[PDB]
Amino acid sequence: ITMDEEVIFETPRELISIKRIKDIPRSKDTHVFAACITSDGYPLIGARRTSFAFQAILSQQNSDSIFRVSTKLLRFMYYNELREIFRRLRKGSINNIDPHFEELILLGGKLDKKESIKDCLRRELKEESDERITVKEFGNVILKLTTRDKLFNKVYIGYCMACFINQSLEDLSHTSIYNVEIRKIKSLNDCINDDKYEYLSYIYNMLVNS
Ligand SMILES: C[n+]1cn([C@@H]2O[C@H](COP(=O)(O)OP(=O)(O)O)[C@@H](O)[C@H]2O)c2nc(N)[nH]c(=O)c21
Ligand code: NA
Ligand code: NA
Ligand code: NA
Ligand code: NA
Ligand code: NA
Ligand code: NA
Ligand code: NA
Ligand code: NA
Ligand code: NA
């Protein structure tokens, strides 16, 4: 990708614009994402601990005696989340479930006050991986990600850089991860059937092949 191509991807849930920019803004809480490449050359992706759908559902409750859920969202939730919703009612079965669902996200987080971009990336990578990810080298390319969530009608902005890390894929793939932010770190190329695979793959390719 050249300095001024903008590419717009669409999935059943998201529209996302990816555009190469020169500098990251820094205001209140800028969001910075790490596209991590392992020592053995694998692109990494996180499975968010809480799905976007279950986060939203929880935020929509307003009564101790009423629980409300759009059934369209059931296919975008984890097993434990579905169990929590239906734990008291316990009907025979439920419909529209995807047992393969995972909420794929680039690792990363919010920029602190007067925190450098690279320090933010190092710190968030450490927090989200239980101290198991360190950065050998940062890439040059900076992408701005603009995402519209089609289900909730919200727009999000973040910025992404490449992080070539010291760890191998296997280094991050024996021990389960205990974060409140992340339930798994895995190879993006183990996720070919995910709604997000095409645009995440594009991000990695643009960051390393430009
Ligand atoms: C709640 N939420 C967060 N994101 C993404 O996650 C990034 C950070 O999300 P955040 O809302 O800024 O902080 P949070 O993780 O504590 O919620 C955003 O820049 C978005 O990329 C989300 N992305 C989509 N498509 N839908 C969502 O509901 C959503
Ligand atoms: Na941001
Ligand atoms: Na049952
Ligand atoms: Na149902
Ligand atoms: Na299920
Ligand atoms: Na999905
Ligand atoms: Na994304
Ligand atoms: Na590390
Ligand atoms: Na290591
Ligand atoms: Na998806």
Short mmCIF file of all heavy atoms in Angstrom, two decimals, residues 29-31 157-159, ligand 2:
data_model
loop_
_atom_site.label_atom_id
_atom_site.label_comp_id
_atom_site.label_asym_id
_atom_site.label_seq_id
_atom_site.Cartn_x
_atom_site.Cartn_y
_atom_site.Cartn_z
N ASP A 29 -7.40 9.50 24.69
CA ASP A 29 -6.96 8.11 24.56
C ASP A 29 -6.99 7.59 23.11
O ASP A 29 -7.97 7.03 22.63
CB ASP A 29 -7.78 7.21 25.50
CG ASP A 29 -9.28 7.29 25.26
OD1 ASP A 29 -9.71 7.99 24.31
OD2 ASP A 29 -10.03 6.64 26.02
N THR A 30 -5.88 7.81 22.42
CA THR A 30 -5.64 7.23 21.11
C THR A 30 -5.53 5.71 21.29
O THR A 30 -4.92 5.25 22.25
CB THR A 30 -4.33 7.79 20.45
OG1 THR A 30 -4.43 9.21 20.26
CG2 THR A 30 -4.06 7.13 19.11
N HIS A 31 -6.11 4.94 20.37
CA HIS A 31 -5.94 3.49 20.39
C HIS A 31 -4.87 3.02 19.42
O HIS A 31 -4.93 3.30 18.22
CB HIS A 31 -7.26 2.79 20.07
CG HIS A 31 -8.13 2.58 21.26
ND1 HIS A 31 -8.92 3.58 21.79
CD2 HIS A 31 -8.31 1.50 22.05
CE1 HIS A 31 -9.55 3.12 22.85
NE2 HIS A 31 -9.21 1.85 23.03
N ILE A 157 -11.95 4.51 15.88
CA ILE A 157 -10.69 4.86 15.21
C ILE A 157 -9.53 4.24 15.98
O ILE A 157 -9.52 4.30 17.21
CB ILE A 157 -10.49 6.38 15.12
CG1 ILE A 157 -11.68 7.05 14.44
CG2 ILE A 157 -9.18 6.72 14.40
CD1 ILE A 157 -11.74 6.79 12.99
N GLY A 158 -8.58 3.65 15.27
CA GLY A 158 -7.34 3.19 15.89
C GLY A 158 -6.19 3.27 14.91
O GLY A 158 -6.39 3.52 13.73
N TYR A 159 -4.98 3.03 15.38
CA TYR A 159 -3.80 3.13 14.53
C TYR A 159 -2.96 1.90 14.75
O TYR A 159 -2.88 1.43 15.86
CB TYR A 159 -3.00 4.40 14.86
CG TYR A 159 -3.83 5.64 14.70
CD1 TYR A 159 -4.67 6.08 15.72
CD2 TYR A 159 -3.81 6.36 13.51
CE1 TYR A 159 -5.43 7.23 15.57
CE2 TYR A 159 -4.58 7.50 13.35
CZ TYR A 159 -5.39 7.92 14.38
OH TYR A 159 -6.16 9.04 14.22
NA NA B 2 -7.66 6.19 18.46
#
